[PDB]
Ligand binder design. Structure first.
Ligand SMILES: COC(=O)/C=C/c1ccc(O)c(OC)c1
Ligand SMILES: COC(=O)/C=C/c1ccc(O)c(OC)c1
Ligand SMILES: COC(=O)/C=C/c1ccc(O)c(OC)c1
Ligand SMILES: COC(=O)/C=C/c1ccc(O)c(OC)c1
Ligand SMILES: COC(=O)/C=C/c1ccc(O)c(OC)c1
Ligand SMILES: [Ca+2]
Ligand SMILES: [Ca+2]
Ligand SMILES: [Ca+2]
Ligand SMILES: [Ca+2]
Ligand SMILES: [Ca+2]
Ligand SMILES: [Ca+2]
Ligand SMILES: [Ca+2]
Lengths: 268, 268, 268, 268, 268, 268, 268
């Protein structure tokens, strides 16, 4: 019936020079047997931290329920802290805080070393809300070879995030050529035009689930996102449901995301 | 428990010079008591006729169920034939087939004279799928004072419809001034910009429900519609659900449209 | 299991010099057997008429459901039109439109003459919403011998009602002496203080059910009403539920009202 | 699915010079994982002590049920003893028994030190019945920066509370200037008029839930409370349900209070 | 809601020189409204007549139940008599009894003239068991333009059906050159090999549903049927379920057959 | 009531010269009491290994559910790895990898030594999908005295398996005489033709359950298999259901397989 | 969900000079937390002992069920042995066996010292069947200050009990003065007539629940009991249900008795 959540553990980070918090959900029966589990990475929005999906998202109750009902297979859920010191998911322009490198080169290997994890792309999915939707969306466009499924909920656009990366950086130390380079790497249109054939095929191979409420100011951002993906022939599932920019929407979508990624993990 | 459907009745049209077919759904208890009912106009798509919402849409079973369960209050459903002679809902460019004039000046008054109908805008709503979604959309943008609720399902765009009016017309007799004028009356951007305040207020006061499946080729048209409406401050409900250009989608949506318009008929 | 509604029947009034509309709900089985039924008079709000409880209140579906479930015993529901010519339930101050006289001397005797009605006080109740809630409240305070139960929903106060009576009157024909007298007859504090013992006792014998939503602008009016009745030792049931000034509130309250008066008609 | 209750633990009070009893409810799964929880302070009425909400309120069964069904998120419930030595929640006028200082400077820090509590305003709510309803009400009017939600049930008034503080004080040592000072601090009208703008805004930011039975002698006090709050534009949810001054009323409201505060803890 | 069955009606047949019996199931509500219905032709097995699907198949109960639950749309079910005079569905080789001619030239037009039928191939399906399963299959391979859906249940093969045609014939009147041709028209391998592209494509457009129990002596014939169709790229739905050559098997498949054809009639 | 899965335990093979992986499912309550269990050996398909039925087949959830509902009696499920070094279940022709000998002489004795197993043929069954369906089928045809029930799901044929033995072997060291010898040992027709009466009788005593989806490319293989068994009077259960070569099909059949073998273990 | 029963524990009795057996039901969760519980003393009938309510009454299942459903709050149930040495609940007339004194001075204090019991009259109730109905009835009439609720089931009368006390005694050492005094102390009419105002008011404060089946030989005794209590204005609930002198009756009443006493323990 019931799994458990740890909120106070950390990963020793040399790239960020600190102990980084994360939360982790372990499914019921993680402590019995010796088997391993797939992992869902679940990213919070602006203002919250690694307790957001725990306290507001009610991840323990919602995942316990979905797994016991058979709506989802057992999985591990990992919730990073992207609020302490700097807010956001990407490497800053001044070179002083490379959070994206921390995620792929330190957090993911730590999870695989510490917990009983199936450590392959086919067992790794990523999702998030608002700021974390943009995080999940662009993590997968940068490293499509790391994920099998991606689920941006109420996702911010590339322009919003690049604005956050500039406001968070010391712009006196950043040249104009470097601003132009990262601006292009945070634009969904430019990434798809400039991707080599191998990259674009991995992007088409990823299973995408993109959802947003219709009374959300981000509905326009996500309708433009849907049109861009069809224009580049990236098949995906797209939902615009009754809802707003609120935790009512995200607690309702969480079991849908789990059912979506769980079927990819188990195949069908 | 059970209402009834008549498929074979006609209305004698002076504008079109012929008897025009329609099907009509009367709710259960229509023959008991003396009260009157609100009306939903339900328009078919390209290739089908007045039997379309009857045979494919299964209107009798679905409305019988929604009304018996209380999801919808009792109402009349009218399904006009827009297939015979010429296909489409609008006046052709050559002046030989003014179907839109027929709808508003002959069909609606005939229904209100023949059946026990509450003959007011506050009790009159319109919906349709594909070609009929574009019909419901542009019928309401032309005569916004005529409806309280409008529900385009998988609706075609204005450019698609204007192309249909050209194909069906004798363009040898049509001047370039008329071609340019009618295109502007079939463009939603243009109508909203050229409307006086009294007209634009009535368009915002209409309660809109716009729904389309994500695996439909029209999903892009309807996402662009959602953006255009927001840009002009037309509040509306927008849904993009899992589904395609098929009768599974429209039979799923029919009881939603009925609950949507029923709450407006009864207030809430 | 389905009853029926007549909307188009009238009653010939000498007091008002015209045919006055009413609506009537007859329970299932009215046309089999020869028995008689109690009556609930159900009053609409300002701007609406005798169709209001039919179309907005959905009286037919709600009454059919409550009687078939046994939540209520079978009863007749009468819905008078207090909208045509003048809006309101009371005698105008200029003497040209004595609606309250019509209600008690012509409508109530007519209903008892035309339909199979148990014509005693113990089988007659009155209820209404907003304007009609104030109507029901003061109809019973003026003629307490006429009802066994009274249920004001979201009721306006006497001050609101008196103000509305003046606007509809030709105040050139009205003396200040009559204005002060009528003001006192539309004030609950005055009526309870100035009633002889015989009248005040009948007021206490009536079973009162007073309900209003907390997000209603009339919530303060109805809280003051609860305090006044307690201050004069008039027992009543009082409900302030989650809700607003809406037909969602009043369609919810109709089955509670029907269970309330039904239990009094049948005893317990 | 079962949590647990501790009744026999105490807090060592420097202010009251004794070990002070409290009861605490820990939710299911409190022992597994390392996370923290929000806290609801739940105050008993006159005559009961820290065992009242346990034995009469049946907090363990009711909270176990609401949390397992998902009607509430997991929370900690703390039940202070306000009966031993003196009955009541406030500082006595003679200076020998400052229970209110005890509550805020000793009990709240003790809970946050001893249990895994999210120790912020946004994760702290307070509720109580009768005497404790007034206690919850005026604790929050005195220290509004401490709470995010307040739920007085069948609450006693400000005058009743000030009367208790006097009967419980030795008045020979009490000056007349102080009596008038505390009289004003235990009056809601006085507090709302005389609070500076920063306090008054914080009172409006709190989420209020006020409930009382219609057959309670205190129904008048709480209806006057409803009117006073609207007069000062402090929005709140107000309920007057069928019920009396009884543990039937309070056992029914306990899960409604839990759902109310839980939605505030989790956001929506 | 119950439909009805007529057993005793006949069609006056010039080809067979007699009145031919049939049974017909008309759905609930056939006698209200004026609409039309699709038709399922339902063929009995050897030894039975037009009462077989009525008395043994229990078509009234099964069709009333499937239609009311919404598992199937309303349809007409026609059950021809192929037992009187001679047993079988095909023209006997001696030219004296052209039952296949009777079915397509007299029975189908008579049903369409007498009942409210949608008279098009897109609204016409055929099914049967054993002898009638072979009948449905070879009717559709001979006249593929007549059906949209075909459902042989526990069908006999072409050789068994041809052998029955010989044994019932007067061989004094049979030419051997025609006998050899008809043997080839009653062999599925031969029909598909000899079909021109227009015929072969129409056969692939028909929707096939082939079902047979695994404990049936005919399971081998129907597995070979499945192998032949795939060898010729005729996509179809094939079911081998637990069951025998019995009315337990056929009563279970009848609602499955109805759901299969209903969705094709209504589209999806 | 939850059982448990072990994935990381091995068996020391003298025949294969390495530690060989397997997974094992132990039912709930295996750790209470001293009783013994029957065993189902469950073989994966090509490309997966011993975690395939665990991660994709979800054996833990599906077996936990079937046993708790009583659809199946408690049993042990053993899932061997036939992927490492060489893919497949049979002895290679070059003599370097005799996997079939390993299975019967090392793996089965190890399970019976290590876990509480009823070590008799009447308590031993075998099943699998695709490559593993052929494994189960030909494992049972070679040593039929080892199993009481066999369940090939979507099984490959013997020719498919013989092709795998050739492609996986170094054929330079293999004589033509040996190629002909094993070819005959991997053909179902040949095995049944040459079996002595004792072997043939035990094959008929085995209870066979053969299931395949109709939209699977292997459906022709299994229809031919059904025909072959009937020609040799090998009674069996045969199912052809709606489905493809997918884990939806195989997760659906696993509880059907468990119910089938459980009923044989317990008798009926 | 499940509590537990101890049958083999004993109280060391100075009054009876021996270890006395009792059985005890502890509710689920007794071993978690530190809280205390109310106590129901539950007395057996003639012939049974402290195992009677356990084996025949099935108290463990019935109390587990009533408490888990919330029909009763958790309580401790103590079942004393009144069978060993002498049968009955009262002091023998010869002074050699003061069973009633043992009950009040040794059994009740031992329970409160040994288990976590709320040791006040308001948390103490008594019930019993047959002989134990008379015991519970007359214990409460003798020591009314000890109980808050009393529930005699199918109770014997005082005359029967006094007959039991004599037959169990050595009457040669008992004077006629003691015989007459005890007869009056075991008669319900006499106890109520001679009780001072302090005792009679506590008798009226106790909540009584007296139940007996209609086909029971004691139905007449308990009808007279109902008559006696009413004549002295002792309010009580009285039930005469279908049933006999059997454990079907007493197993039916046990959850009613638990609900009755629970609501007194919790208030309502
Ligand atoms: C319009 O785009 C934006 O302004 C993005 C908001 C934003 C940007 C950087 C931050 O560090 C931050 O944290 C408070 C918020
Ligand atoms: C881009 O717009 C189009 O494709 C027009 C399709 C079309 C238009 C008019 C018709 O009468 C019609 O009938 C078959 C089809
Ligand atoms: C109207 O105000 C009142 O009556 C105050 C009642 C009261 C006050 C203090 C107490 O310690 C107490 O103990 C029983 C009762
Ligand atoms: C005729 O069927 C075939 O070709 C069998 C496919 C096959 C055979 C052996 C393998 O080791 C293998 O590895 C991926 C695949
Ligand atoms: C009918 O009157 C009676 O018999 C009194 C019952 C009774 C009395 C004393 C006993 O020791 C006893 O144990 C069997 C039963
Ligand atoms: Ca899709
Ligand atoms: Ca909305
Ligand atoms: Ca509100
Ligand atoms: Ca009341
Ligand atoms: Ca079988
Ligand atoms: Ca298929
Ligand atoms: Ca009886």
């Amino acid at each position: 019936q019931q799994g458990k959540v740890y909120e106070t553990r950390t990963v020793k980070s040399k790239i960020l020079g600190m102990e980084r918090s994360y939360s982790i959900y372990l499914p019921a029966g993680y402590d019995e047997g010796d088997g391993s589990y797939p992992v869902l990475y679940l990213l919070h929005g602006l203002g919250d931290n690694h307790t957001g999906w725990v306290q507001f998202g009610q991840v323990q109750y919602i995942a316990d329920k979905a797994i016991a009902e058979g709506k989802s297979a057992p999985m591990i859920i990992v919730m990073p802290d992207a609020d302490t010191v700097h807010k956001g998911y990407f490497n800053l322009l001044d070179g002083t805080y490379n959070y994206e490198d921390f995620f792929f080169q330190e957090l993911i290997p730590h999870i695989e070393k510490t917990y009983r994890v199936r450590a392959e792309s086919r067992y790794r999915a990523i999702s998030g809300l608002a700021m974390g939707g943009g995080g999940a969306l662009f993590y997968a466009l940068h490293y499509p070879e790391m994920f099998v499924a991606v689920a941006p909920l109420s996702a911010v656009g590339g322009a919003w995030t690049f604005d956050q990366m500039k406001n968070q950086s010391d712009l006196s130390k950043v040249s104009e050529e470097k601003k132009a380079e990262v601006l292009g790497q945070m634009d969904i249109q430019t990434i798809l035009e400039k991707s080599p054939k191998e990259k674009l095929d991995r992007i088409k191979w990823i299973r995408w689930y993109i959802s947003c409420g219709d009374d959300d100011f981000l509905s326009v951002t996500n309708c433009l996102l849907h049109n861009t993906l069809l224009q580049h022939q990236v098949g995906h599932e797209f939902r615009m449901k009754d809802g707003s920019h609120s935790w009512t929407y995200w607690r309702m979508e969480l079991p849908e995301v789990m059912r979506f990624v769980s079927r990819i993990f188990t195949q069908y």
